[PDB]
Structure 1
Amino acid sequence: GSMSFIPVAEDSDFPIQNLPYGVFSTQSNPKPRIGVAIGDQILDLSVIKHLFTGPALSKHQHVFDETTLNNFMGLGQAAWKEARASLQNLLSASQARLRDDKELRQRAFTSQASATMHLPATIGDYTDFYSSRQHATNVGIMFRGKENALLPNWLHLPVGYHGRASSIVVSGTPIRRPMGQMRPDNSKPPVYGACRLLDMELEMAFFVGPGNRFGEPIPISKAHEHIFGMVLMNDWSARDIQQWEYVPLGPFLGKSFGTTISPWVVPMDALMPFVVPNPKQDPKPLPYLCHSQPYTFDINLSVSLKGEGMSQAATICRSNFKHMYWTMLQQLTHHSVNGCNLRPGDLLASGTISGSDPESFGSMLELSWKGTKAIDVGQGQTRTFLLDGDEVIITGHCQGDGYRVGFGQCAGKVLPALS
């Protein structure tokens, strides 16, 4: 194990083994600033930036002064590793530098309870992949049937689409049920009204570090050098609006009304201890998508739902990121194979995370099986899709011996449509 001079509860999401990056502000200071979570506190990086005396950061301390993590993300792995090593030393229970500097320590730390979290970065482009095999299979069965579940290209490339960047909001942001066009009756023209099949989608997403030049693909051998860290994501969906609009150009308004992400970006370095061998792929992908480097992660995911009249939230999904068929390396490589330029701060999501066990399906569309099964949310109460006032909270964590690497919350409450 390892210990910080800052007290850390055994089940805390933020032990010294984690050290996630976030943007926060406080009642005392409205300026959004970069911080690192440790225990129940936040270490203000702008206050201690002068302590980053290493080669990679000494002339780049200004990145810790920014209102977003973009510049830090754009520095690259040498900088990330140096920052992490510095923080591990400084927060160490045996290191005196910060521990014994009473005045520095006083203005460098703030309680997480006092902080308002903001989006970690300015996202230039958001991309949603569709890499969970059971998810695509489930949707396939409902749409086409048991026999033609997966479409021809699924096993050959990590299919994905460009999402809406503007509507990616931080955990805690209320999400209003969307108005739009839908076609409930095929024998009648479409109608305008409030979404009737509001859903959540359990996902995880990673931020891009240094980008690639316009026109220059990122070789899969170098893909890992561009992955900064991860966050939890709830890709809120309006299924009825989506179904009517999506053919042939893809998900659009049924997705863009809101997408929530957790605030704390857990660095890839903190997740490496939980890496496991990649799933066997058959057919074997083309050479450009082939890599031996293990890059599949054992991250326990959970989703709870709490109706406005409920006192206790019901856990409706227990899944794991290790189910994913295509890795983040294959996704990033594929995303740049044509020359597309990924940039620092870009966000690439996994797609709904569903395992084979029905208990691990990552969307109410799957859990209620298209509204044909009731989801048990605690006696006297059931659900098919989201009701106004419902709060959905996604959490996740890696379990180590005597410690865990957690992500904090990815929450949102449904507000009534303007109807």
Structure 2
Amino acid sequence: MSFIPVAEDSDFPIQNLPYGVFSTQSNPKPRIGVAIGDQILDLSVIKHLFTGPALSKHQHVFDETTLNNFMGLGQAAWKEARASLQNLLSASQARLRDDKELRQRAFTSQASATMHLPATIGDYTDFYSSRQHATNVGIMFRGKENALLPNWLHLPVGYHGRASSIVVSGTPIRRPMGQMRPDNSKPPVYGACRLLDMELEMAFFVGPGNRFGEPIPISKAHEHIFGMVLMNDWSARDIQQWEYVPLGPFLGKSFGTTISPWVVPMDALMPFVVPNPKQDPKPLPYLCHSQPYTFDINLSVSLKGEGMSQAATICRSNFKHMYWTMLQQLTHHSVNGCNLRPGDLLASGTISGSDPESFGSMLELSWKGTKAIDVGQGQTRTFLLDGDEVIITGHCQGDGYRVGFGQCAGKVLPAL
């Protein structure tokens, strides 16, 4: 089904076909591509091959420097694009395989490519939808009997994030300065954050908007989910704890948030859908959906420090843990008439399962700095050190192939 060979270890078989923005040494202009094997198929080069009804008059979306306009076309266009790509790669429509002059312009090596943020993100929201993550933060901060606050099981709690500091995989992250209060009996101090953390999340991009004042009913929520990326919500826990009452996390989150560049479309993930977790209490009707919209995605996080020769896997978790689905999050986010826009990023929350090996932050893995995490070669961590590199990966396991997400990586630079 693909004339482009795909190795067994590839994140990018024919069943994936994610969208990203890339550039090369020869042509520095960011442009839209699709990953296949170790190659990128350049959609600006092949834009004229999308001849179907939804795209024939809208080929210009493939000439843009971001995915926003393609996202905003909606599901008929996404489905047509994916079918066109499938038919070109199988050579059912043989133009791309057989037009050698087009072909040699259209495919470039991933290894030689530079990736960019896939969209101009107008608004970013971070949810809090893993019951074990919220419970753990609760146990650590408020105690076992108060682990979950009263609203949590009733709505998908979330907060507005900082869009400007969402950066693409591979961007170094500087340890932030700020204010903290390490001794509650004394005034706060200014200094480098001491409790620098990662957060394993996933996120989706919004497709067509909704108009200002017009909620998206849950029945239609699936029409607005374009596809998914990996996210690391870097966090400065000492800055966070001091600032956050009563208006929520702010500078403890906004110094950096990393996403992976390849946006895996929802149609690629639908084969990996599983039943939705039972919610008790049942949510209010506006949040109810029968459609399965929970996904079996195997997630891993590695840490490698300065001097260390091998990265250690510190977390293995799964997106299927989450209590509230993306449909519920999208619907709740628009219930009040808030206008979601193409390229908005809605993140899941930190993805922790019940097994401590699956906790999605070092705040949890180290239990607030009370337990050392073994990172191999005689080294241990509670929170991140200068020079540490964190890499998140994710895969769906098919029969004889995997749909992978590439990398969501960053290295910590010293405070300056």
- With the shorter chain as reference, the TM-score category is over 0.9
| Offset, 1:294 | 0.3
SS of 1:23's equivalent in the other structure is strand
Equivalent residue number for residue 134 of structure 2: 136
Q: Return the match for 1:24 from 22, 30, 38.
A: 22
| Offset, 1:95 | 4.8
- CA distance in 2: counterparts of 1:204 and 1:343, whole angstroms: 19
Equivalent residue number for residue 312 of structure 2: 314
- CA distance in 1: counterparts of 2:11 and 2:186, whole angstroms: 52
| Offset, 1:102 | 1.0
CA contact (8 A) 2:303 2:312 kept: yes
Instruction: String of CA shifts for 1:166-222, please: whole Å, max 9, x gaps.
Output: 000000000000000000011111000000000000000000000000000000000
Instruction: String of CA shifts for 1:289-344, please: whole Å, max 9, x gaps.
Output: 00000000000000000001111000000000000000000000000000000000
CA RMSD of aligned residues (A): 0.6
Equivalent residue number for residue 72 of structure 1: 70
- CA distance in 2: counterparts of 1:122 and 1:351, whole angstroms: 21
CA contact (8 A) 1:202 1:362 kept: yes
Please, which runs of 5 or more residues in structure 1 have no aligned partner? Answer: none
- CA distance in 2: counterparts of 1:292 and 1:74, whole angstroms: 26
- CA distance in 2: counterparts of 1:100 and 1:55, whole angstroms: 24
SS of 2:253's equivalent in the other structure is coil
- CA distance in 1: counterparts of 2:100 and 2:331, whole angstroms: 47
| Equivalence map 1:247-258=2 (5 Å) | 247-258=245-256
| Offset, 1:96 | 2.5
- CA distance in 1: counterparts of 2:121 and 2:7, whole angstroms: 33
| Offset, 1:92 | 1.1
- CA distance in 2: counterparts of 1:175 and 1:142, whole angstroms: 26
SS of 1:229's equivalent in the other structure is strand
| Offset, 1:11 | 2.2
SS of 1:241's equivalent in the other structure is helix
Report the more deviating stretch, 271-280 or 86-95.
86-95
| Offset, 1:93 | 5.5
| Offset, 1:101 | 1.3
- CA distance in 2: counterparts of 1:78 and 1:94, whole angstroms: 21
CA contact (8 A) 1:390 1:414 kept: yes
SS of 1:184's equivalent in the other structure is coil
CA contact (8 A) 2:298 2:317 kept: yes
- CA distance in 2: counterparts of 1:286 and 1:4, whole angstroms: 45
CA contact (8 A) 1:120 1:264 kept: yes
Instruction: String of CA shifts for 1:257-299, please: whole Å, max 9, x gaps.
Output: 0000000000000000000110000000000000000000000
Equivalent residue number for residue 303 of structure 1: 301
Equivalent residue number for residue 266 of structure 1: 264
Question: What TM-score do the two structures reach when normalised by structure 2?
Answer: 0.99
| Offset, 1:97 | 1.7
Equivalent residue number for residue 231 of structure 1: 229
- CA distance in 1: counterparts of 2:91 and 2:316, whole angstroms: 35
Q: Return the match for 2:388 from 387, 390, 394.
A: 390
CA contact (8 A) 2:181 2:187 kept: yes
- CA distance in 1: counterparts of 2:26 and 2:393, whole angstroms: 29
Q: Return the match for 2:206 from 205, 208, 212.
A: 208
Runs of 4+ aligned structure 1 residues displaced above 3 Å come to none
| Equivalence map 1:48-197=2 (5 Å) | 48-92=46-90, 95-197=93-195
| Offset, 1:379 | 2.9
CA contact (8 A) 2:308 2:377 kept: no
CA contact (8 A) 1:6 1:93 kept: no
- CA distance in 1: counterparts of 2:93 and 2:283, whole angstroms: 48
| Offset, 1:144 | 1.0
| Offset, 1:10 | 1.4
- CA distance in 2: counterparts of 1:329 and 1:366, whole angstroms: 27
- CA distance in 1: counterparts of 2:337 and 2:22, whole angstroms: 35
CA contact (8 A) 1:5 1:94 kept: no
Question: What TM-score do the two structures reach when normalised by structure 1?
Answer: 0.99
- CA distance in 2: counterparts of 1:211 and 1:94, whole angstroms: 34
- CA distance in 2: counterparts of 1:148 and 1:204, whole angstroms: 27
CA contact (8 A) 1:199 1:237 kept: yes
- CA distance in 1: counterparts of 2:96 and 2:339, whole angstroms: 40
